[PDB]
Amino acid sequence: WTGQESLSDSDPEMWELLQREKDRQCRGLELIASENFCSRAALEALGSCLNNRYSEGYPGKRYYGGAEVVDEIELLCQRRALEAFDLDPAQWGVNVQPYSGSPANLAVYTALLQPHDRIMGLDLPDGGHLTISATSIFFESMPYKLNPKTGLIDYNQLALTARLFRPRLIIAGTSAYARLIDYARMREVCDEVKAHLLADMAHISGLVAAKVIPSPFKHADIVTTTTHKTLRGARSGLIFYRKGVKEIPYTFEDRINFAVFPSLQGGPHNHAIAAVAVALKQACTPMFREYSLQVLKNARAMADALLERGYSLVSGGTDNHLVLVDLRPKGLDGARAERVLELVSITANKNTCPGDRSAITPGGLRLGAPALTSRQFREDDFRRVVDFIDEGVNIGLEVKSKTAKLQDFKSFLLKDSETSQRLANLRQRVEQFARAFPMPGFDEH
Amino acid sequence: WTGQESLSDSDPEMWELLQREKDRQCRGLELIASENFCSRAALEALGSCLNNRYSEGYPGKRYYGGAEVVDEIELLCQRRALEAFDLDPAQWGVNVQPYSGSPANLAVYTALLQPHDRIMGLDLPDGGHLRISATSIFFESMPYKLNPKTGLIDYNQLALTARLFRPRLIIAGTSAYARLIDYARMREVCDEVKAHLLADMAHISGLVAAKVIPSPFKHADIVTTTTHKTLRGARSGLIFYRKGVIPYTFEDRINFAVFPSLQGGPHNHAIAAVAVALKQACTPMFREYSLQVLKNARAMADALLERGYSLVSGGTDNHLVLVDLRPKGLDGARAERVLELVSITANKNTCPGDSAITPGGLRLGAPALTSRQFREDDFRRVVDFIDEGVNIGLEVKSKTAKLQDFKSFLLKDSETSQRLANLRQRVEQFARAFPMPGFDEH
Numbered sequence A: 001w002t003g004q005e006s007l008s009d010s011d012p013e014m015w016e017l018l019q020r021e022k023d024r025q026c027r028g029l030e031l032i033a034s035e036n037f038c039s040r041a042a043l044e045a046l047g048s049c050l051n052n053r054y055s056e057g058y059p060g061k062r063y064y065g066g067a068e069v070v071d072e073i074e075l076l077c078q079r080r081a082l083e084a085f086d087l088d089p090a091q092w093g094v095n096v097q098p099y100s101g102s103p104a105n106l107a108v109y110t111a112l113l114q115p116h117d118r119i120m121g122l123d124l125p126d127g128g129h130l131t132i133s134a135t136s137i138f139f140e141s142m143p144y145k146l147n148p149k150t151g152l153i154d155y156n157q158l159a160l161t162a163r164l165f166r167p168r169l170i171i172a173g174t175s176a177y178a179r180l181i182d183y184a185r186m187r188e189v190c191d192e193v194k195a196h197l198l199a200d201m202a203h204i205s206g207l208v209a210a211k212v213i214p215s216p217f218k219h220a221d222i223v224t225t226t227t228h229k230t231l232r233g234a235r236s237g238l239i240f241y242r243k244g245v246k247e248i249p250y251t252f253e254d255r256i257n258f259a260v261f262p263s264l265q266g267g268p269h270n271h272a273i274a275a276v277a278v279a280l281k282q283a284c285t286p287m288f289r290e291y292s293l294q295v296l297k298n299a300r301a302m303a304d305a306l307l308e309r310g311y312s313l314v315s316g317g318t319d320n321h322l323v324l325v326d327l328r329p330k331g332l333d334g335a336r337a338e339r340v341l342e343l344v345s346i347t348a349n350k351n352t353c354p355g356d357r358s359a360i361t362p363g364g365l366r367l368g369a370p371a372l373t374s375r376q377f378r379e380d381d382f383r384r385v386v387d388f389i390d391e392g393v394n395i396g397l398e399v400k401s402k403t404a405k406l407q408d409f410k411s412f413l414l415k416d417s418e419t420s421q422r423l424a425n426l427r428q429r430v431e432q433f434a435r436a437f438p439m440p441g442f443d444e445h
Numbered sequence B: 001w002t003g004q005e006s007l008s009d010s011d012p013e014m015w016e017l018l019q020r021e022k023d024r025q026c027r028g029l030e031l032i033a034s035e036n037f038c039s040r041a042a043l044e045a046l047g048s049c050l051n052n053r054y055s056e057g058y059p060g061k062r063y064y065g066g067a068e069v070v071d072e073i074e075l076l077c078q079r080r081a082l083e084a085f086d087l088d089p090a091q092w093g094v095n096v097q098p099y100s101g102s103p104a105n106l107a108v109y110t111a112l113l114q115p116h117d118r119i120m121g122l123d124l125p126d127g128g129h130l131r132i133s134a135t136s137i138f139f140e141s142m143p144y145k146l147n148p149k150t151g152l153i154d155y156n157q158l159a160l161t162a163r164l165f166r167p168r169l170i171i172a173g174t175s176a177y178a179r180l181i182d183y184a185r186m187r188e189v190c191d192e193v194k195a196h197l198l199a200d201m202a203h204i205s206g207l208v209a210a211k212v213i214p215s216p217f218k219h220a221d222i223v224t225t226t227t228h229k230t231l232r233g234a235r236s237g238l239i240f241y242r243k244g245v246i247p248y249t250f251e252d253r254i255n256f257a258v259f260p261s262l263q264g265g266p267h268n269h270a271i272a273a274v275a276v277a278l279k280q281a282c283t284p285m286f287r288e289y290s291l292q293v294l295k296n297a298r299a300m301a302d303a304l305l306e307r308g309y310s311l312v313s314g315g316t317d318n319h320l321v322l323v324d325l326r327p328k329g330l331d332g333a334r335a336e337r338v339l340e341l342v343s344i345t346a347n348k349n350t351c352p353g354d355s356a357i358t359p360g361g362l363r364l365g366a367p368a369l370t371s372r373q374f375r376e377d378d379f380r381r382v383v384d385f386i387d388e389g390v391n392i393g394l395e396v397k398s399k400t401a402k403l404q405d406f407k408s409f410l411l412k413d414s415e416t417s418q419r420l421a422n423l424r425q426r427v428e429q430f431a432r433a434f435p436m437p438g439f440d441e442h
Helices: A012-027 A040-046 A068-084 A101-112 A134-138 A155-165 A183-193 A205-209 A253-264 A270-284 A286-308 A334-343 A370-374 A379-401 A406-415 A417-435 B012-027 B040-046 B068-084 B101-112 B134-138 B155-165 B183-192 B205-209 B251-262 B268-281 B284-305 B332-340 B376-399 B403-412 B414-432
Strands: A092-095 A118-120 A169-172 A196-200 A222-226 A237-242 A322-326 A349-351 A364-368 B092-095 B118-120 B169-172 B196-200 B222-226 B237-242 B320-324 B361-365
Touching: A012 A417, A012 B040, A012 B068, A012 B268, A040 A270, A040 B012, A068 A092, A068 A270, A068 B012, A092 A253, A101 A134, A101 A169, A101 A196, A101 A222, A101 A237, A101 A253, A101 B251, A118 A155, A134 B251, A155 A183, A169 A183, A183 A196, A205 A270, A205 A286, A237 A253, A253 B101, A253 B134, A270 A286, A270 B012, A286 A322, A286 A370, A286 A379, A334 A349, A334 A364, A334 A379, A334 A406, A334 A417, A349 A364, A370 A379, A379 A406, A379 A417, A406 A417, B012 B414, B040 B268, B068 B092, B068 B237, B068 B268, B092 B251, B101 B134, B101 B169, B101 B196, B101 B222, B101 B237, B101 B251, B118 B155, B155 B183, B169 B183, B183 B196, B205 B268, B205 B284, B237 B251, B268 B284, B284 B320, B284 B376, B332 B361, B332 B376, B332 B403, B376 B403, B376 B414, B403 B414
Parallel strands: A118 A169, A169 A196, A196 A222, B118 B169, B169 B196, B196 B222
Antiparallel strands: A092 A237, A222 A237, A322 A364, B092 B237, B222 B237, B320 B361
């Protein structure tokens, strides 16, 4: 055992699996949950010897051996994050250790709130498509809601209801929201009621960095994010925090750092920090701004094509990487569409429409442009992506007429021969279209 | 821009640093914190398109598109994990999503306890340096004790205080303890006081797989671990739990605590790397490696005993040895610093008789160097270099008063820095010649 023998030679079972995922990403239309195709350079650092370094604690104050290079990476990653978001290092700091998105938010909560302190966040922030929570368990949550008429945040009810609830922390964030969040309005409500504003910009950070949308940094105390959504890097988290005066100084740095370690996490994933750091250098470039504009252009193109075929869209359209389809008028629910699209190699997830209760089978569907725009899709290509989605939906409506239960519907897609061929036909064309485009990452895996 | 260009071309600055870490890993003696060197096959899964795959939820119940392949990698990793610890699928399940060890443990607390329920773990379970823990913040913790004279865990005193305190959960686990933990005895206590036994085998779990030390699964009903210490995999975490039988109710709650309570999407690249490594862990080869880790610890202990270093608890049954430097007249602060400057990695440790006192100890481990085909004679050779480091430490501790002055002296003094550079070069020669698991250059 050398320890240096390839994956394909030493573990065929797993290499066979790895290749199926690479083929699927290449052959399919990837529209799911603001995901992306990570670059080769970032991935190289992600699966590297940096995986082997213990480095509990923080750069500067690690006195045990070996953490000297890893210090310089962590400190580099910070500067590049502050650069990507055009932040004054005197006014802003950043903690690059959080293992993913949720651990980033959890570390902010435990840093600034006592157990049982009160938090407010948007109800069903990610769509509610998987029907307690950290927020709800160790602290006292109260949701604010979307306004069912407009599909936008009901900032009024949020302002009115927060005066009564008295939260110490309000979250400004939603991964299933196709419009721009009014951070200044959220800052009003927080200052009045005497609360921290946390901008969770998980799925839109690359857009914020490229300056194709308004920055929550101009208004938020704290900003959390992910690094694998619209930022195009590795799966990781970040926590940005203000520092300096306003002379009463901010006290975020030490509490936020102490919450990540030692309160919640162990030693950081230095492989992940380096892969993030690669992607953030990439994000600073003009190439990434031109990409981010194309993301918006493509999502708007997608939105228009759906509208032009008589689809309803939650909130009328988009200012965003996302477009939320409301399928209820068209006659299909989200679970049904979600499934049918999988079988023709199109990844989406269902989404709860504003107005509908928990027990209604979500009638919407969340789509997003980041992944495919990274494969050099233009507006024409997304217009043609919608042709494929619409055809898939029309198969669904045919099968809805011939079936009753969700389980009847689902079996009928596989077993009815006239349906399984129409799906196979749409799958073959979808796949003929998608393969032709380039793909970021490695050739083979 | 393709996103397909090499790291060295598109980011020379980062590539430089990456190779400095790889170089430092090859030329150094690496004894810190039970860390290891990950297989190339494992790191190839880690550097992969699996990074791109969203899959919040669990296999079989993920109805959004794209998850078909990742459903299989997750379930395969579970079977490969239950296989590696010789666990029957009817009696044991395993959750392979924890982002690391501390999330793996935190998920178990929230799964089983309410907030403010009572817990008991070992005081300073990791050691010294770097209401503190999240376990202290949300729950009501009262620590249990090492016996300050012997070095071992005070099982009698633990049972005394546990009768008073009425804990709901007890944590068996220390990443700074050179001994076997009497899991039978801890279950006897937890049965008596009606409490859950959690076994955090984080640092030792590779040894448990290879059957070279006794298994906590015999006596515990929840087991957490890491996958990058003795298991040699990528950085991650696991939660093993009972199922079957009057049935167990751990599966649903544990799963809910991981998602949606504490985590978002799983890291499927890391899960896939773990799965590569648990396959490696099921082989006779891995058992050779693990026996050699235990024997290289003893070989390291005995060479330190043979120069009259006191070791906490007399020695080791383990992958690591805990060196008491209070007799020798140096502290863990100065020791780890000198060793760092001659490419030897270790960390300071609190000795049983003392907290706010500079830790007069040292934690050294086999796993990493044993993975470079180090034998007993190579570890006695390691102790030679460590001993020369300690000696230089005493040489400087005489000449200088405070740590700020001490550390400055190691760089600024001409005669010391040359004797350092000389020792360093003899360590870097010795180590560079050994083989290294992983990629050639990064």
